[PDB]
Structure formats: C-alpha cells, structure tokens
Design a protein around this nucleic acid. Structure first.
Ligand code: MG
Ligand code: MG
Ligand code: MG
Ligand code: MG
Ligand code: MG
Ligand code: MG
Ligand code: MG
Ligand code: MG
Ligand code: MG
Ligand code: MG
Ligand code: MG
Ligand code: MG
Ligand code: MG
Ligand code: MG
Ligand code: MG
Ligand code: MG
Ligand code: MG
Ligand code: MG
Ligand code: MG
Ligand code: MG
Ligand code: MG
Ligand code: MG
Ligand code: MG
Ligand code: MG
Ligand code: MG
Ligand code: MG
Ligand code: MG
Ligand code: MG
Ligand code: MG
Ligand code: MG
Ligand code: MG
Ligand code: MG
Ligand code: MG
Ligand code: MG
Ligand code: MG
Ligand code: MG
Ligand code: MG
Ligand code: MG
Ligand code: MG
Ligand code: MG
Ligand code: MG
Ligand code: MG
Ligand code: MG
Ligand code: MG
Ligand code: MG
Ligand code: MG
Ligand code: MG
Ligand code: MG
Ligand code: MG
Ligand code: MG
Ligand code: MG
Ligand code: MG
Ligand code: MG
Ligand code: MG
Ligand code: MG
Ligand code: MG
Ligand code: MG
Ligand code: MG
Ligand code: MG
Ligand code: MG
Ligand code: MG
Ligand code: MG
Ligand code: MG
Ligand code: MG
Ligand code: MG
Lengths: 157, 82, 80, 205, 121, 129
RNA sequence: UAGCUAGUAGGUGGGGUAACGGCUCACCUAGGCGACGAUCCCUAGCUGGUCUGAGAGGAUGACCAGCCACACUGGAACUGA
RNA sequence: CCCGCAGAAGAAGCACCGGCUAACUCCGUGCCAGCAGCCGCGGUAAUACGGAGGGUGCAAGCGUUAAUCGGAAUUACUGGGCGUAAAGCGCACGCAGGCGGUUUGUUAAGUCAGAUGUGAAAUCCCCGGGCUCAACCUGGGAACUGCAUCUGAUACUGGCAA
C-alpha cells in the first residue's frame, strides 16, 4: 500500500565562511488510498537522496482519515500558519478539483471527488499540513453517534 | 379594436404562428393581452400540429374582438372540418 | 379596510396641513443588517388638530396641492 | 473537421493501442510502439499534473475521432445531465453513430465507420443518416442500405469483429447487416483503462 | 469591518485605470507618424530600439515600438497602432502593426508571420 | 456592557470545554433555559439545574467522551448587531446535518431538523458543531 | 458642492383642465426641502435580459421584446378619438 | 428533399514549443540583430533571437490587440484585517444615531406560517417535440432571491405597560 508521490522539491542555502552550500528539501505525501495519509518533509545534500529521506519519514508519520465512500463527511476548514484550506464533500460525480500540493495529499488519501480551495498563502508545506489538520479534524457520523450517546439513526435520519 | 391574430415566430423557412389576442394598433410580434394556443403550418401528419383554446376565444369574441382571416379558418379547422 | 399608515408628526405650522414622518424597519440588501429608514410625507387635516410630536394615522387620497397627497384619518396618542 | 494525418503516430505518443490503425490484422508490432513518439522518444518525460490530464483527454479524443470544440460541448451536456459527470462524458461519446457502427462490426476502424455513416450507407429506423455525431437513442436499429449492402469493405470488416470483445449493450445480426442498439452503455462494460476522472478535472479549471 | 460602518460608508470598489490611452476601447488606431528614431533601453539590455512618435487620429501624441527586423516607416507614412508595452523603453506603451496600411511586412520571415505581417513562401 | 447575554452563555461553554472544566455557572433567564434544554435534549450537555429564587444561577454540566470534549465548536449567528432570520426552505444544516442549529421558531425553541419537519423557520440563534 | 428656495410652502376665492392639482391668478399666512444628502456639479435612456461567477456579487444594456424620449436648432398652436 | 452520372478526383489552417504552459536537437546575426505577458533571454558552444527542422497545439480557422468578469478571501455580506508588515483619532465629555440586564402582563411593527392576487412574453432551467443530427426553432411545467393584501403561529426583536 505505497501510493507514494512528490509534491515539491526546493533548493536552499546555508552560507558559511567559504561560500554558499546548497542542499535540497523534498515534500512527499504517502497513503494507502483508503483513509491513510502521511506527509514527510526531509532534507539532504543531493536531490534524489533527499526524497528517500523524505519517504522514510512520510511512512511513519501517518494519520488516519475516516471518510465516506470516496469523499469527505462534511465541509471542513483546516488552518495552518497562513493557509486557510477549505474543502467540501461533493457528490459521487466530479473529481478532485483542488490546487497543487492540496490535491496530492487528497488523491493518495483516498478521496475521489471534493471541492477545495486554499486561501491566504499557498506554500506547498503549510497547505499540505493544513489539509492533514483539516482531514484529521474531520469526524464521521459513527464517531458523532457514539460521542453524544444517542443513536446513529436518530441523528442522521 | 382588440383582435385575435397570428404573431409569426420560428426560424427562416420554418414559420410557427403564435395565435394571440392583441390590440390592432400594436405590432405583429409586439404587445398583447394573452396568448391563446398556437399554429404550426409545417407540422405534417404526426402527433402535434394546431392547438387553439376555444374557452378563451369565447371570452374575447363574445365581448367584442375581431378574428383575423387565418384564425377564423383555424376555428373552422378545429371544430368540424373532418 | 383602508390601507392606513401610522406616523409621528414632524411639523404643524403650515395652516390646514401637517408633515409626518413614517419610520419603516427595512433591511439592507447587501450587508443584511436592518435599518430604521424614514418616510417624510405631507398630509392634509382640517384645523390645527394635531400639534408637533405625536402619533398620527394617515390614508392615501386625492391630490390637493403640489405634494400633500395623503390625508388624516384620526388622532391616536396626543402630544405629551 | 477530421485529423487525416499519420494515425499510428498518435498511438505512440499516447502509448496505448488506440484502435486507429486496428484494421484487418490484429496486432501491429510495426512502429516501435511506446518508445518513439517523434525524433526524441528516447527522452523520458517529467510529465506534470497538467500533462497527464491533457494526455488522457487527447487519448479519448483521438480514440473516438472528436475535436476540442465538439468534445468540450459533450462535457457541458455531461455536467447538466443527472448522475456521474465522468460516466456521462464517455456514455455520450459511446452513443455516437460512428462509434456504434464501429462496435456493430460494420467498419474495420472507427474512421471507416465514420465514412460509411457519411456516405449514405448507414440507416436507422427506416431513415438515412449522414452525421457521425448522431446521438443514437436507446432502443434503435442501425443497418446498411440495400444498395451498398455486402460490398467489399464491409464483409471483410465484419469478420474482424469476431476477434473483438463485442459489447453487451448492443446486438448484431451479421447475416443481413442489421444492428440493434438496446440500452445505454455502462462504465464497467467497456474500456476498463481510460480514466474519466482526469478529463473531468481538466475542464473544471 | 463593522456591519454598521459598511451601511454608512459602503465598500469603495477599486476603480483601476487602463494602461493604454488609445481611448474608446479601440483595438487599433491610425497614426500619421512623425520623427522615426532609435532609443536605448533601461539596465540589463543595451541596444538600438526602433520607435516613432505617433500623431494619433484622436489628437493624442504617443510613441510606438516598431517590431521585427527592418522597416519602411519614415517622416510621415500612415501606420496602424495596437496596444502593448515593450517593458524596457520607459514611455513606450504601443506597437505598430506590421503589414497594416503603409507599414510593410518584415523581409524573409517564415515562422510566426501573422505577427510581422508576411505572406506565404 | 453585557449587551448580548446568549453569546456570553455559549462562550462559557466553549471556554469551559477548553479548560476541561466539569460545570459552568452563570445568570439564568427564559431564553437561557430554552437553549440549554435543547443542547441537553440531543446530548452536548449532560444535565443542568436552575438553583435560586431571587438571583437564579443556571449551572450546566459539560460532557466529555474521550480526552476530547463533546462540543467541537459553538458560535453565535443571530447576534444583536446583525439579526439573522431564515425561512423554512432556507434553514441551515450545520456540519452536513450531523451538527445542529438552535433556531427560535414560534412553537418553542428547537433544532433545525425539528424546524424543517414541523414546517416553519425563524431566528437561527447558534450553530453547534 | 451645506445650504438651497419667493408661485417658493400652505389657505380662501375666481378662472382654466377630459380629469385633480400654484396647473394658473388675486389676497392671506411663513413656510417647504436639507446630514436616512437638499443644492450644484459630471456622466447616463430605462427594463426583460446579456456576459461572468461555486454562489453572493461584478460589469453591461448591440441584436429580439416592453416603456420613455427625440425628428435640421428654438418656440407656439391648428386639426383630430 | 430524392434519384442517376463521373472520378480521390475540388477541398487547409496559424500559434508556440526557457519558466508559468502540453512541446528541443542545431546551424546562431556575439548585450549587434532582436525577443518579451510576467521572471527575465542575447557578451564565439542557447530549448528564450532569424532561419532551416522534429514535434507541441490547435482547426476553417488560428493568432495579436481592446474590452468585462474570473483567479483577487488584492473593498472580504457570505469571506480579510489594524503590538512590530499599510492601518487605534493625543486624551476626554456628549446630543443625533447603533446596541441594551431581567419576570409577569398586553399588542403584533419586525419576525415566521398559510392563503389569494400578481411577478408581460421571450430568455434560463427540466420534461418534451420538431426539422438527416446539430446549432436553431418549438409544446408543456418549474422559476421570476418580488411585492401587495387577507388571516394566523408570538419563541425571538421592538413598541405600550407593571
Ligand atoms: Mg496572499
Ligand atoms: Mg499566491
Ligand atoms: Mg508553489
Ligand atoms: Mg513564493
Ligand atoms: Mg411532408
Ligand atoms: Mg387581406
Ligand atoms: Mg392597528
Ligand atoms: Mg403634482
Ligand atoms: Mg466547426
Ligand atoms: Mg471553472
Ligand atoms: Mg468580516
Ligand atoms: Mg500589455
Ligand atoms: Mg516568437
Ligand atoms: Mg432570572
Ligand atoms: Mg419560564
Ligand atoms: Mg401670485
Ligand atoms: Mg383634447
Ligand atoms: Mg468568485
Ligand atoms: Mg445601467
Ligand atoms: Mg442598432
Ligand atoms: Mg432585424
Ligand atoms: Mg428591438
Ligand atoms: Mg408613461
Ligand atoms: Mg423641432
Ligand atoms: Mg418643440
Ligand atoms: Mg418644450
Ligand atoms: Mg381639439
Ligand atoms: Mg477508382
Ligand atoms: Mg485517378
Ligand atoms: Mg555595438
Ligand atoms: Mg493580455
Ligand atoms: Mg560548429
Ligand atoms: Mg518562450
Ligand atoms: Mg527558437
Ligand atoms: Mg513543419
Ligand atoms: Mg479571437
Ligand atoms: Mg472580490
Ligand atoms: Mg490583508
Ligand atoms: Mg516601520
Ligand atoms: Mg505600521
Ligand atoms: Mg500613519
Ligand atoms: Mg491610543
Ligand atoms: Mg446618544
Ligand atoms: Mg433602537
Ligand atoms: Mg432584550
Ligand atoms: Mg432601543
Ligand atoms: Mg407582520
Ligand atoms: Mg410569508
Ligand atoms: Mg403564486
Ligand atoms: Mg417572464
Ligand atoms: Mg419556453
Ligand atoms: Mg429523453
Ligand atoms: Mg430536444
Ligand atoms: Mg427530436
Ligand atoms: Mg424526427
Ligand atoms: Mg437553446
Ligand atoms: Mg411557455
Ligand atoms: Mg407555469
Ligand atoms: Mg419545490
Ligand atoms: Mg421561489
Ligand atoms: Mg432565474
Ligand atoms: Mg388577530
Ligand atoms: Mg408576550
Ligand atoms: Mg401559546
Ligand atoms: Mg415583548
């Protein structure tokens, strides 16, 4: 259950007595495609070395996402730093009409169709955490039924 | 003088008349009181063709509305004829 | 029954006529918040019956000047 | 209106077999498939998210023989219809007359079916039809006219259709060149490879 | 903010000006043309950019960049002017449409000939 | 100074749940009891009282399921600066129908789900996620 | 652009209007509009709609259809339903 | 609209292809010629200039330009802010205005429910039908976030009370 993919690669500089040494930062999000997601940042001297370092972190740092059929349960915000991230469930129609970075996290998570938009900034790292904060926050009617101690049918129906 | 006349709508070479109760002075396609069915001259032998609500015609013709040369005959077409 | 309108008087120093404000509590189209909008009307009345600052019932009627189309119905709650 | 260019070139760029150059023989092995789109087919593409979508859209266009203006109109109809937007895109394409004529077996290729439709050969419900984009209604009977019945191009082309998968949603007589379009095509019945999802995404932005 | 402040003074929508005063939403305009002359760009460039003072028909007096290699413009010669800045020459905010009116097509251009107004080979 | 009393109630609930606090004491009222009863009826709050004669102090008893609190979010909608009255068909549904909206309609105060079926709308007091 | 306004704002009476009315007169009172924008200024036919938008909105009002306005530029009446 | 005739015969496009944006090899006019929508290219080895040339892309059109919206949550009502990024009047008092604790009455202005009238036709939408399909035309419903009245819920807001 890999379904691993890259969002962004970005080179960064240290600056020392000699000169400016360049390293590279990755950002890989991985998931089963069935309610599991996990971003992993990673950083290294060479490019392809950094993405393997990112992928190892990504697998361990994995969050569960209870989701309906192939879509979200309810419209959900998930703020992080300067990225708002709104996303609506939508029907069995459509696809993942969401931004880059914002949809890499969604498609590997296992949601097949949602409405979505990233307000504020749209920095690849923070929007990926913003979505994961939003999806981790997103409860299901089975959780909500047990939470209030009432009935699965009396709430939903 | 109110009058029951055909309005002429539809595409080029494919007319579709909207039989309508209007003032004589008002234009062919323009102002009217209320439309009272329709007429399709290029309908042919099939499901639909001409429909003319005869209850509304009695409300205007009974009062005092002239019927045009064509609409007078579409009344003659719908009632009896065959 | 007649389509009357309640309204508080603004001024009555005109001889045989009276100007009346009608507060209407309509909401703002865009923003959604309510507003206490005013409608100042000129109104006819026989003699100086209603003074300044009192509630008055008003009815739509024949025009009897330039402006001043409305007319008095009755007095309710006289001047304090 | 039509492509009318090197047809098998499109299959290499896309990668998969598009059935443009299907014809009399079954398998080609006659283009260096996959590894030669053009002069620089050895170049492994990076292939962006916009790319994969645009490649998937071009695949479905080039299979069915439809242009962007007419294809964009199918999306607009597909959105307005009930149910899944993705399933409608494909279902409206599959309901085309040149597609039905190909799936009946009256044409070795889909371009052949289009010309056979165009040239007054095809006839449905006792009415001749020239239009490739004619939306074939459920419960119809496509057929070939008696003048151009059992000509050279059709009889050889119908024998190819025995090797083909053959759809369940339509039925063919084969003796008297007579077809029967029964129900609307299901998603799971056909293809099982071309992704609708990515096409729905492309037009949404 | 504050819903009552918005009732009292509404959201003043930012009326952004147009870049190109050719006026009346015109796609192009005719220019009689005066003074055809070369000019240097800003900082990283360095070149002799071809440009001319356009006496526009409506009464305005602007400068327009002559694209392509070589031209037949001189002294007068009536020219068609389209919108579009060069982003190098400060002040120049228009282009002369090559091919239209007296402004001829560029000599020996084959790829991209709608721009530069050249016929088939 | 203490203009909206109902908003002040919903904050004491929102802050009480954030502080992991058991009970939430506050001044009582007619409308205060009506909202607290509807929250109790469904099951955000677990029981309440109105202990007092002259100066009544309505104290709630906040619910907890795991370590996390039950009231995920709660906010005022129809506030005194901007009153919000919605019609029958235009009534909201909080959290795609698994949260509620306390709506003041005529037939007492009640939930948005109850308002739909009863066949009326009114002043939407607060969303409760 | 914070003040504008003298048939101006109301009354009685006479005339006039198909019709009521400062529509117009004579006299009488001193008003009326105005910070929920009068006045003055610049621009503008208006609407059904059109284009756009997830929608709220934003922009616009060619074609088709309703209504107004104008007829070389300023007036006046005659004739007539 | 139909039928016979002759023979593929009469029947193509113009963008751009550093990046954003699907598409690169090289002969380059050496900060010259030029490019450009932004970042920026071009200084004897260029995917960014002309050119030949593979494609990339679009089709009887395609480009460039002007113009409106969009993306711009960059006038934010839905939906932004104001310690240091642009932004708390130097600090008070205060009429008009906005808002207002709390229990019993009482009204019904707001508010909601119902009903009737109307919101011209076209347009939009759905269901249809009609022209070889299609644009197009067109039958029938919904809608036209209205407003108006008439009668009712009176929880909540206001008024008039104690
Ligand atoms: Mg930003
Ligand atoms: Mg940004
Ligand atoms: Mg980015
Ligand atoms: Mg950045
Ligand atoms: Mg016939
Ligand atoms: Mg005659
Ligand atoms: Mg009353
Ligand atoms: Mg008047
Ligand atoms: Mg075409
Ligand atoms: Mg879109
Ligand atoms: Mg705000
Ligand atoms: Mg420009
Ligand atoms: Mg170029
Ligand atoms: Mg109390
Ligand atoms: Mg009580
Ligand atoms: Mg006088
Ligand atoms: Mg007369
Ligand atoms: Mg928008
Ligand atoms: Mg306008
Ligand atoms: Mg015209
Ligand atoms: Mg015409
Ligand atoms: Mg017209
Ligand atoms: Mg009029
Ligand atoms: Mg004149
Ligand atoms: Mg005149
Ligand atoms: Mg005059
Ligand atoms: Mg006369
Ligand atoms: Mg031959
Ligand atoms: Mg030959
Ligand atoms: Mg030099
Ligand atoms: Mg542009
Ligand atoms: Mg060499
Ligand atoms: Mg470029
Ligand atoms: Mg080049
Ligand atoms: Mg070529
Ligand atoms: Mg164009
Ligand atoms: Mg905006
Ligand atoms: Mg800001
Ligand atoms: Mg500073
Ligand atoms: Mg500052
Ligand atoms: Mg300052
Ligand atoms: Mg201060
Ligand atoms: Mg005050
Ligand atoms: Mg108040
Ligand atoms: Mg109160
Ligand atoms: Mg008050
Ligand atoms: Mg009411
Ligand atoms: Mg109602
Ligand atoms: Mg109705
Ligand atoms: Mg209508
Ligand atoms: Mg219709
Ligand atoms: Mg159907
Ligand atoms: Mg149809
Ligand atoms: Mg049909
Ligand atoms: Mg038919
Ligand atoms: Mg249409
Ligand atoms: Mg109709
Ligand atoms: Mg209807
Ligand atoms: Mg309904
Ligand atoms: Mg409605
Ligand atoms: Mg509508
Ligand atoms: Mg009653
Ligand atoms: Mg009461
Ligand atoms: Mg009761
Ligand atoms: Mg009360």
């Amino acid at each position: 259950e890999l379904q691993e993919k890259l969002i962004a690669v970005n080179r960064v500089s240290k600056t020392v007595k000699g000169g400016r040494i360049f390293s590279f930062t990755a950002l890989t999000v991985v998931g089963d495609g069935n309610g599991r997601v996990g971003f992993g940042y990673g950083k290294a001297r060479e490019v392809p070395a950094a993405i393997q370092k990112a992928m190892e972190k990504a697998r361990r740092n994995m969050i569960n996402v209870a989701l309906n059929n192939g879509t979200l349960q309810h419209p959900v915000k998930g703020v992080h730093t300067g990225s708002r991230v709104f996303m609506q469930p939508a029907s069995e129609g459509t696809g993942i009409i969401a931004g880059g970075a914002m949809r890499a996290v969604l498609e590997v998570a296992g949601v097949h169709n949602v409405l979505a938009k990233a307000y504020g900034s749209t920095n690849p790292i923070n929007v990926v955490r913003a979505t994961i904060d939003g999806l981790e926050n997103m409860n299901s009617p089975e959780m909500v039924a047990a939470k209030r101690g009432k009935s699965v049918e009396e709430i939903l129906g | 003088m109110v009058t029951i006349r055909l309005a002429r709508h539809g595409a080029k070479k494919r007319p579709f008349y909207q039989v309508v109760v209007a003032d004589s002075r008002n234009a062919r396609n323009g102002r009217f009181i209320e439309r009272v069915g329709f007429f399709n001259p290029i309908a042919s032998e099939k499901e639909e063709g001409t429909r003319l609500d005869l209850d509304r015609i009695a409300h205007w013709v009974g009062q005092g509305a002239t019927i045009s040369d064509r609409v007078a005959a579409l009344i003659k077409e719908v009632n009896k004829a065959a | 029954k007649i389509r009357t309108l309640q309204g508080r008087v603004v001024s009555d120093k005109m001889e045989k006529s009276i100007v009346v404000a009608i507060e209407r509590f309509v909401k703002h189209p865009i923003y959604g918040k309510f507003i206490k909008r005013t409608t100042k009307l000129h109104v006819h009345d026989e003699n100086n019956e209603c003074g300044i600052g009192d509630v008055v019932e008003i009815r739509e009627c024949r025009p009897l000047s330039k402006t001043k189309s409305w007319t008095l119905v009755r007095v309710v709650e006289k001047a304090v | 209106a039509r492509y009318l260019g090197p047809k098998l070139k499109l299959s290499r760029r896309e990668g998969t077999d598009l059935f443009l150059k299907s014809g009399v023989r079954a398998i080609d092995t006659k283009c260096k498939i996959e590894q030669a789109p053009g002069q620089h087919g050895a170049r492994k593409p990076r292939l962006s998210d916009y790319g994969v979508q645009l490649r998937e859209k071009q695949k479905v266009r080039r299979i069915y023989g439809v242009l962007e203006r007419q294809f964009r109109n199918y999306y607009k109809e597909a959105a307005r219809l009930k149910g899944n937007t993705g399933e409608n895109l494909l279902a409206l394409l599959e309901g085309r007359l040149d597609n039905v004529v190909y799936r009946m077996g009256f044409g070795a290729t889909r371009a052949e079916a289009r010309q056979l439709v165009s040239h007054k050969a095809i006839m449905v419900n006792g009415r001749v039809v020239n239009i490739a984009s004619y939306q074939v209604s459920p419960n119809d009977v496509v057929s070939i006219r008696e003048k151009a019945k059992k000509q050279s191009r059709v009889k050889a082309a119908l024998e190819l259709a025995e090797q083909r998968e053959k759809p369940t949603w339509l039925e063919v007589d084969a003796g008297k060149m007579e077809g029967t379009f029964k129900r609307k095509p299901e998603r799971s019945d056909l293809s099982a490879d071309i992704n609708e999802h990515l096409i729905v995404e492309l037009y949404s932005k | 903010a504050t819903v009552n402040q918005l009732v009292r003074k509404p959201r003043a929508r930012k009326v952004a000006k147009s870049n190109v005063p050719a006026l009346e939403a015109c796609p192009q305009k005719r220019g009689v043309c005066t003074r055809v002359y070369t000019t240097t760009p800003k900082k990283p460039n360095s070149a002799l950019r071809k440009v001319c003072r356009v006496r526009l028909t409506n009464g305005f007096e602007v400068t327009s960049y002559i694209g392509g290699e070589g031209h037949n413009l001189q002294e007068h010669s009536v020219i068609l002017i389209r919108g579009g800045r060069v982003k190098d020459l400060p002040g120049v905010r228009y282009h002369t449409v090559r091919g239209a009116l007296d402004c001829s097509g560029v000599k020996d251009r084959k790829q991209a000939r709608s721009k530069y107004g050249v016929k088939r080979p | 100074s203490m203009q909206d009393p109902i908003a002040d109630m919903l904050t004491r609930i929102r802050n009480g749940q954030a502080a992991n606090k058991a009970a939430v004491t506050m001044p009582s009222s007619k409308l205060k009891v009506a909202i607290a009863n509807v929250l109790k009826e469904e099951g955000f709050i677990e029981d309440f009282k109105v202990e007092g004669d002259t100066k009544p102090e309505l104290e709630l008893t906040l619910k907890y399921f795991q370590g996390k609190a039950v009231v995920e979010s709660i906010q005022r909608v129809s506030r005194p600066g901007l009153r919000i009255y919605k019609r029958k068909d235009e009534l909201p549904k909080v959290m795609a129908g698994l949260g509620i909206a306390v709506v003041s309609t005529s037939k007492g105060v009640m939930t948005d789900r109850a308002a739909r079926q009863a066949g009326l709308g009114g002043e939407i007091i607060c969303y409760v996620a």
